[PDB]
Assembly symmetry: C3
């Protein structure tokens, strides 16, 4: 395992998702309110899933070699198995918060599926120049999702309770900044232009992942907005 210089960030990533998982699980034990049970379920599953994928990467199962640029390139495919399942869960947390209509939910999830799916094709593509075509398409899907999180949700939030409006605003600004970092890291790291080496690329995705998952989860689950208005 220690054979790879990026092992330390995978181990740390694995540790933080595990602790994040346990904390949310224990904290959600004293919850009976049907609405809150939804947010806790969605938000505990996120780092539990990430935990398993970080572990598969640490143990070397979630890693394949991809030939391009005349080199065998280490590609951690498990990142995309992670994101495939956890990014729609995160979107669902946001969408439920503002009581999004079903059409908008299906559009967000579908676009998110396209974003992660094309990114994975981009990561596994053997023809160097074509990798960035898939990058561009995935990034376009991402921009659609961010548009809707701004110009279809923000103006839905303030028609709702103030505590769901203020919490959503914060989670929306946290999401847009963090999510936008992901295609930049990809483009400059070993999957893309290869300016930043794999061990720093792994560190960067690890910081973003823990922030996006456990950090987001902590902001959300300490808000009273997850509870129905009850006396």
């Amino acid at each position: 395992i220690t054979g790879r210089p990026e092992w330390i960030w995978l181990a740390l990533g694995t540790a933080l998702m595990g602790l994040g998982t346990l904390y949310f699980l224990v904290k959600g034990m004293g919850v009976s309110d049907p609405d809150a049970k939804k947010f806790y379920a969605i938000t505990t599953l996120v780092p539990a899933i990430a935990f398993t994928m970080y572990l598969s990467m640490l143990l070397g199962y979630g890693l394949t070699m991809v030939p391009f640029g005349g080199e065998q390139n280490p590609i951690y495919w498990a990142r995309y198995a992670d994101w495939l399942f956890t990014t729609p869960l995160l979107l669902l947390d946001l969408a439920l918060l503002v009581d999004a209509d079903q059409g908008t939910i299906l559009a967000l999830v579908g676009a998110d599926g396209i974003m992660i799916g094309t990114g994975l094709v981009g990561a596994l593509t053997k023809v160097y120049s074509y990798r960035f075509v898939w990058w561009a398409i995935s990034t376009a899907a991402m921009l659609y999702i961010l548009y809707v999180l701004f110009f279809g949700f923000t103006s839905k939030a303030e028609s709702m309770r103030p505590e769901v409006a203020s919490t959503f605003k914060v989670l929306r600004n946290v999401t847009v900044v963090l999510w936008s970092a992901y295609p930049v890291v990809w483009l400059i790291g070993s999957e893309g232009a290869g300016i930043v080496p794999l061990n720093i690329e792994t560190l960067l995705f690890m910081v973003l992942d823990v922030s996006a998952k456990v950090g987001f989860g902590l902001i959300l689950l300490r808000s009273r907005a997850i509870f129905g208005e009850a006396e």
Copy 2:
């Protein structure tokens, strides 16, 4: 890319899904009605997904070689990744139209999953005779879906509004004819008996796909049945 004679139909297929996607996306911009937002979301995702899969085929990512009949046979596995996601979306458009009960929706989606899943196993199977066993099972699943679209939906449609009844009738006759063509093409093309060569097989699936996706979408989204009855 031009190495394969079927490249022209993949390129054309890619182009038409892209334009179909853009047209539906722009057209759905001026939509606020919660019901219509569902149909637009479902119906824009269909060619967006197909667009990505046609592109993966064009660039050669969605293609593998399968040994049978003592030959290496080009199999476009991405067709099934496409259909896996877009055929239930199409079914969902129909089911929502007639306000299908949940049990019937789950049965349609499940059978559709079986139909595409067994077809993919059929396409990748190394023992020639066994390929047609999977064909038969997939075709049986298909026949179940068509039965329900006739003797569980048509008699649901006319208890509803006339504009949802007339639109559903048309989309049901369009679906049954187009869908039934798919197992015939498979059986006679390179995946099956191999009487029709791959480049014509690709053309035929391309015509059916654009018709089934963009054509169906156009009939649906110009109907007033997607809107709730509003003053």
Copy 3:
């Protein structure tokens, strides 16, 4: 096909799922009640899916070789493709019975996904000792699901009708005993410690699968609890 000594149990498994499928399908023909249509759809899909996976195993498609312990080990990966789809359907049958809240449903399905997903990673893992780490994690997910089926459902059941309470009790005791057998068989069979040979391991999973699927289905679908209270 007869090349493998376990072929007889795959053939028998295939046969029983097929007959189970046909029986449920015919029996659900005379059903109009919207609630009952849900249970019949969920419960017919279960052995139909298993039927296809048992057949893929019988024909040899659902089998790969995995190197560990310095040996090429036959691993039937199709078991997990089966379980991936059928175990949440079974959970859904239970959850609908007691009218589980949505949060609890998402938590059960998510944990079940983790349980099957980590089990599959465990089955395909090349480093012998690591296989049991994935076993432990999958088994922990399983224990979470059983906890909820006891201390979040049983006390939901008796607030409901007596016929849904008594049926759920039986299906809950049947599920907990049968499901718990699965990680034991894995640990002692060829995927784990390898004390029991593959042909007996296949027999054991076959008995459990038919019991868990067709047996469970028969108990459920002969109960009046699947029907709404109607005059």
